[PDB]
Design a protein around this ligand. Sequence first.
Ligand SMILES: CCCCCCCC/C=C\CCCCCCCC(=O)OC[C@H](COP(=O)(O)OCC[N+](C)(C)C)OC(=O)CCCCCCC/C=C\CCCCCCCC
Ligand SMILES: CCCCCCCC/C=C\CCCCCCCC(=O)OC[C@H](COP(=O)(O)OCC[N+](C)(C)C)OC(=O)CCCCCCC/C=C\CCCCCCCC
Ligand SMILES: CCCCCCCC/C=C\CCCCCCCC(=O)OC[C@H](COP(=O)(O)OCC[N+](C)(C)C)OC(=O)CCCCCCC/C=C\CCCCCCCC
Ligand SMILES: CCCCCCCC/C=C\CCCCCCCC(=O)OC[C@H](COP(=O)(O)OCC[N+](C)(C)C)OC(=O)CCCCCCC/C=C\CCCCCCCC
Ligand SMILES: CCCCCCCC/C=C\CCCCCCCC(=O)OC[C@H](COP(=O)(O)OCC[N+](C)(C)C)OC(=O)CCCCCCC/C=C\CCCCCCCC
Ligand SMILES: CCCCCCCC/C=C\CCCCCCCC(=O)OC[C@H](COP(=O)(O)OCC[N+](C)(C)C)OC(=O)CCCCCCC/C=C\CCCCCCCC
Ligand SMILES: CCCCCCCC/C=C\CCCCCCCC(=O)OC[C@H](COP(=O)(O)OCC[N+](C)(C)C)OC(=O)CCCCCCC/C=C\CCCCCCCC
Ligand SMILES: CCCCCCCC/C=C\CCCCCCCC(=O)OC[C@H](COP(=O)(O)OCC[N+](C)(C)C)OC(=O)CCCCCCC/C=C\CCCCCCCC
Ligand SMILES: CCCCCCCC/C=C\CCCCCCCC(=O)OC[C@H](COP(=O)(O)OC[C@H](N)C(=O)O)OC(=O)CCCCCCC/C=C\CCCCCCCC
Ligand SMILES: CCCCCCCC/C=C\CCCCCCCC(=O)OC[C@H](COP(=O)(O)OC[C@H](N)C(=O)O)OC(=O)CCCCCCC/C=C\CCCCCCCC
Ligand SMILES: CCCCCCCC/C=C\CCCCCCCC(=O)OC[C@H](COP(=O)(O)OC[C@H](N)C(=O)O)OC(=O)CCCCCCC/C=C\CCCCCCCC
Ligand SMILES: Nc1nc2c(ncn2[C@@H]2O[C@H](COP(=O)(O)OP(=O)(O)NP(=O)(O)O)[C@@H](O)[C@H]2O)c(=O)[nH]1
Ligand SMILES: [Zn+2]
Ligand SMILES: [Zn+2]
Lengths: 198, 198, 185, 132
Amino acid sequence: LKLLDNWDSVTSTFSKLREQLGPVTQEFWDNLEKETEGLRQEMSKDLEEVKAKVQPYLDDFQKKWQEEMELYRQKVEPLRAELQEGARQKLHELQEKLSPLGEEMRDRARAHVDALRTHLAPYSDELRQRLAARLEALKENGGARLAEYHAKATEHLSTLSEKAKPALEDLRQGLLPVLESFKVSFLSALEEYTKKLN
Amino acid sequence: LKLLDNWDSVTSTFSKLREQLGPVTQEFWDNLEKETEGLRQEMSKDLEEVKAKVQPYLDDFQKKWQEEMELYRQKVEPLRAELQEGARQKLHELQEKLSPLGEEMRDRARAHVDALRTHLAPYSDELRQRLAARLEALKENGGARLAEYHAKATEHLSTLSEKAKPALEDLRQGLLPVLESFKVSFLSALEEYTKKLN
Amino acid sequence: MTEYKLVVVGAGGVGKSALTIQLIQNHFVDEYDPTIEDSYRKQVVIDGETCLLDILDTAGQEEYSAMRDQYMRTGEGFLCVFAINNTKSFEDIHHYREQIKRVKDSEDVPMVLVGNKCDLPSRTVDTKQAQDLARSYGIPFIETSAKTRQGVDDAFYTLVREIRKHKEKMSKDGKKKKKKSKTKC
Amino acid sequence: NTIRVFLPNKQRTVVNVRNGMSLHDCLMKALKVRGLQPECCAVFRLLQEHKGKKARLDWNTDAASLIGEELQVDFLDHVPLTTHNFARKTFLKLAFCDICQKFLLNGFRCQTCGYKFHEHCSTKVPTMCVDW
Ligand SMILES: CCCCCCCC/C=C\CCCCCCCC(=O)OC[C@H](COP(=O)(O)OCC[N+](C)(C)C)OC(=O)CCCCCCC/C=C\CCCCCCCC
Ligand SMILES: CCCCCCCC/C=C\CCCCCCCC(=O)OC[C@H](COP(=O)(O)OCC[N+](C)(C)C)OC(=O)CCCCCCC/C=C\CCCCCCCC
Ligand SMILES: CCCCCCCC/C=C\CCCCCCCC(=O)OC[C@H](COP(=O)(O)OCC[N+](C)(C)C)OC(=O)CCCCCCC/C=C\CCCCCCCC
Ligand SMILES: CCCCCCCC/C=C\CCCCCCCC(=O)OC[C@H](COP(=O)(O)OCC[N+](C)(C)C)OC(=O)CCCCCCC/C=C\CCCCCCCC
Ligand SMILES: CCCCCCCC/C=C\CCCCCCCC(=O)OC[C@H](COP(=O)(O)OCC[N+](C)(C)C)OC(=O)CCCCCCC/C=C\CCCCCCCC
Ligand SMILES: CCCCCCCC/C=C\CCCCCCCC(=O)OC[C@H](COP(=O)(O)OCC[N+](C)(C)C)OC(=O)CCCCCCC/C=C\CCCCCCCC
Ligand SMILES: CCCCCCCC/C=C\CCCCCCCC(=O)OC[C@H](COP(=O)(O)OCC[N+](C)(C)C)OC(=O)CCCCCCC/C=C\CCCCCCCC
Ligand SMILES: CCCCCCCC/C=C\CCCCCCCC(=O)OC[C@H](COP(=O)(O)OCC[N+](C)(C)C)OC(=O)CCCCCCC/C=C\CCCCCCCC
Ligand SMILES: CCCCCCCC/C=C\CCCCCCCC(=O)OC[C@H](COP(=O)(O)OC[C@H](N)C(=O)O)OC(=O)CCCCCCC/C=C\CCCCCCCC
Ligand SMILES: CCCCCCCC/C=C\CCCCCCCC(=O)OC[C@H](COP(=O)(O)OC[C@H](N)C(=O)O)OC(=O)CCCCCCC/C=C\CCCCCCCC
Ligand SMILES: CCCCCCCC/C=C\CCCCCCCC(=O)OC[C@H](COP(=O)(O)OC[C@H](N)C(=O)O)OC(=O)CCCCCCC/C=C\CCCCCCCC
Ligand SMILES: Nc1nc2c(ncn2[C@@H]2O[C@H](COP(=O)(O)OP(=O)(O)NP(=O)(O)O)[C@@H](O)[C@H]2O)c(=O)[nH]1
Ligand SMILES: [Zn+2]
Ligand SMILES: [Zn+2]
């Protein structure tokens, strides 16, 4: 009920904020001017003197860059030839390997693949005989399981219905009065709740 | 009786399931035995033939592997020789560059660093002069900022006092009857819980 | 390392020492050797922290002893191990349960029920019987087997877990139990 | 009949013997459980008014005659106390290594003790499993 009373005090705080804002921003403004001008004292020096820093530094750096660049042409460039020769020799070494060993590997693979034709291929067929017997077992056992499952399904249906009937019956029989009791409790609760929170 | 009766229905179901479990496991184990039995006879094919045929299989692959190892060993000898001879030449060629160009790089580094030191010498001292001005600027201005900050803080503390004393007092004195009435509602709410949930 | 006082009780022939040796030394026994005073201590790690389990064996073939009351009072965790292949063991638990209550001077103590020899075909006591029993006293039940070595470690870990929650619960509940009760109208 | 069987360091196993069993008979019961050799061990009886040394007894001594006496089997060819036995058993729960600054994986732990350590903690922690 005293929402305006509290709001008043809150507004007073805002009024106090305004009372501070004025002087604070005024001196802060001058402070900012102090800082800007103060920073400008060092900034002007930094900027003007940076010319006598970046320029000679870029020159000094470029001199080293030029040196290194020229040195790279006297190192990396000839080294590229050394690399080329080294690679060419390695390629030559590789050619005398990739080709002979390649054909050898292919020939090895021939003996392996061809062996698999007498190892895996026939075994795949031999496995078929076993798989056929296994599948037959799974079929006979499956047919039996199907019959048992189907039979047990009916058995479960009878047990379920035998319990579902009394379950639903009793549940309904109990739900009727229990729901009424709940309704009474809820109604009395709501009425009282509406009294507390009115 | 709600939970007890509902539970009883589950108990009967569990008991019924137990009477079914027996025949189920008895028939399942019987069928499982047929499955395992078939697999036992199949074991006299799967494992028997896998071990019987593993001999020529392993012997073939092993014989071929031995040939492969032989060929690899007969090749690794001369091939490693070319690799070594080539490596020696390639490494020596690199050394023939790593020595003169390496020393040159060291000598060039001398000049590179020399110019760096010679240039950084006045630079560092000038940086000291820069830092002096930078720090002093922030020192003179800093003192002003500290003085202003202290003043602003003090003015903020006085306005804060208006919140800590007048505002807080009214807040507490205002919240007092609110808390009291709150306790009343809470008390009645406590009763509502025990009156409806117990 | 946290130290835990564990005491095991049970009838004779249930395989009480079998569990200890199988858990500590990791070996199995076959000879019926009655125990009088066995002390097994192993350093393990339960729930991150190092746990030093101090287990003291009991004498299955003994009567009321004043000395037994002594060390049993020093125990914080109690394990009621019995064989489900013997009806006597299932009944004997009632005697020990009440005994511990008197020794610890408390009606509520950390106890766990364990049915050993559960892998034996001589299982006369059904799991449901033990479940309903344990539920009535507010205690857990484990189907431990020394021969198979299954459920052994966990059976002991269960006690430690409950003990930790027990000591913690003490400062949470504060022996309050309930607040106020009210009927309709 | 109460035979107080004491083991090396600080262990005790009071078994129940009867009929006509000797020390070795009871020893055999513990021997299979411990998995050690009696060759490095010796049967020492209770210090019957001694200066401060164990009294070495015979292996074929009647246990019934020692009813109420404390017998201890210490090592005469080996060292007593408990040793830090290395166990390479895999973990079940991810117990964090509060000894280090990271998590603990498939590390190692002792069988007699409970020192959890990594593959680095092995030769890192100077504080071995020595606790008095
Ligand atoms: C114009 C615009 C405005 C101005 C802009 C520029 C402003 C510049 C002002 C300041 C910049 C300073 C930059 C350097 C700051 C650190 C100086 C320093 O205090 O450096 C000390 C090191 C000590 O080395 P140590 O042998 O005692 O310890 C070796 C220990 N262990 C074995 C790991 C590696 O000095 C050494 O490392 C030197 C010997 C080792 C060198 C290793 C390779 C370093 C990388 C390149 C070569 C650099 C050569 C010159 C020295 C560079 C140092 C970073
Ligand atoms: C559904 C979506 C997810 C699917 C995931 C799986 C996908 C792949 C499908 C199947 C793969 C299953 C792999 C796991 C199989 C069970 C493994 C197992 O852990 O099982 C355990 C049980 C109980 O004991 P335990 O090992 O837990 O306890 C002692 C060991 N411990 C210390 C550690 C407790 O084991 C037992 O109950 C008794 C076991 C007896 C085994 C006898 C084997 C005899 C050998 C051959 C028989 C003839 C074979 C003929 C060919 C057959 C081809 C298929
Ligand atoms: C590696 C590939 C696994 C998956 C294969 C394909 C799926 C196969 C089907 C099921 C998985 C069977 C896995 C069997 C091996 C588990 C090994 C394991 O790593 O085991 C870890 C747990 C950890 O926990 P712990 O140390 O506290 O337990 C034991 C406490 N202690 C030692 C005192 C013994 O220890 C234990 O398993 C105790 C030892 C094993 C006991 C197995 C008992 C099996 C009996 C019935 C199975 C019921 C399954 C119900 C599934 C319901 C799904 C909704
Ligand atoms: C369609 C599926 C649903 C079918 C209908 C329901 C089937 C239910 C199956 C069996 C019935 C029993 C289920 C379990 C009932 C009890 C649950 C429970 O006791 O609740 C509380 C525990 C508290 O534990 P505690 O340590 O605080 O107290 C330990 C005991 N005390 C306090 C002494 C020390 O909760 C725990 O233990 C936390 C255990 C967390 C275990 C995580 C295992 C993760 C492994 C694999 C992930 C996938 C699992 C499912 C795979 C299905 C494959 C088909
Ligand atoms: C997403 C759907 C999943 C459906 C279920 C199947 C998932 C399959 C996925 C991955 C394969 C998991 C295979 C797990 C096999 C059992 C692992 C196990 O429980 O190990 C328990 C042992 C216990 O201690 P311990 O003293 O025996 O071992 C001491 C250390 N030790 C190994 C090296 C001697 O701890 C150890 O082994 C140390 C830890 C390493 C154990 C490696 C065991 C490898 C065994 C078989 C290889 C995997 C076969 C299945 C591959 C399936 C691919 C899809
Ligand atoms: C082609 C490749 C296909 C891959 C398909 C799967 C991709 C999965 C994604 C990433 C890869 C994950 C690989 C995880 C491998 C775990 C291997 C493992 O072995 O890990 C073991 C640890 C437990 O220790 P242990 O087995 O080493 O020793 C057990 C005792 N011993 C030593 C005998 C045997 O496992 C634990 O700790 C687990 C503890 C319980 C964690 C419960 C987490 C539940 C949260 C989410 C799971 C929800 C599952 C259902 C679907 C949810 C959808 C939102
Ligand atoms: C069947 C699997 C089929 C998988 C098919 C393929 C996909 C699989 C998917 C994911 C792979 C999951 C692999 C999980 C492997 C581990 C399973 C497991 O290990 O499963 C049980 C464990 C707990 O084993 P245990 O405690 O005996 O420890 C045993 C170790 N040992 C001796 C310290 C305490 O599970 C845990 O560890 C997790 C933490 C359990 C904490 C329980 C207690 C919680 C306490 C308070 C709860 C408060 C809740 C408040 C309300 C929260 C609302 C949000
Ligand atoms: C588009 C919107 C983007 C929004 C981006 C911001 C929000 C992102 C969402 C959630 C905030 C996530 C903040 C980062 C959480 C990192 C959790 C974590 O795990 O990063 C990894 C570190 C690894 O540590 P480690 O490898 O050295 O050790 C093992 C650590 N481990 C067991 C995880 C195996 O984990 C650790 O350090 C854990 C070390 C132990 C800490 C114990 C803390 C106990 C107290 C409270 C636990 C709170 C757990 C909260 C889990 C939240 C999961 C989402
Ligand atoms: C008869 C009571 C007996 C006692 C009962 C005690 C128990 C009561 C507890 C629960 C009962 C009520 C249970 C209510 C469950 C409501 C569940 C629900 O509707 O969730 C969805 C609503 C949707 O709101 P809306 O559609 O406005 O917003 C949609 C949203 N903009 C969008 O576009 O997505 O979410 C919202 O409304 C959230 C914002 C609401 C804004 C308006 C909020 C308005 C709230 C109050 C109105 C002013 C009250 C002033 C004080 C009155 C008492 C003095
Ligand atoms: C990135 C995504 C992250 C979120 C992912 C969410 C989905 C995760 C997917 C699956 C979560 C599965 C969570 C499963 C939690 C299972 C929790 C549980 O009760 O485990 C009970 C036991 C294990 O503890 P035990 O008390 O038996 O101790 C070992 C025992 N003494 C022994 O010797 O073996 O194991 C069993 O009883 C076997 C139960 C087999 C049936 C389990 C059926 C489980 C089905 C439902 C129950 C779930 C319970 C979850 C935990 C609840 C804790 C309150
Ligand atoms: C849009 C989303 C924006 C998200 C923004 C997130 C911002 C988060 C900001 C800060 C997060 C924290 C960032 C922390 C950075 C590291 C800070 C740090 O080094 O603190 C010191 C610790 C010291 O560890 P020690 O091992 O030495 O422990 C002993 C300690 N020194 C002593 O004896 O006193 O260092 C450690 O590593 C101790 C823990 C080691 C295990 C760490 C395990 C891992 C722990 C934490 C991982 C945090 C990962 C955060 C990834 C953020 C990605 C954006
Ligand atoms: N088959 C089988 N037998 C077990 C199991 N646990 C214990 N036993 C048997 O129970 C009998 C006694 O075991 P044990 O604990 O050594 O003796 P006890 O009768 O318990 N007396 P105590 O515990 O005082 O030493 C022995 O036959 C032992 O093998 C088990 O898990 N499986
Ligand atoms: Zn570590
Ligand atoms: Zn150790």
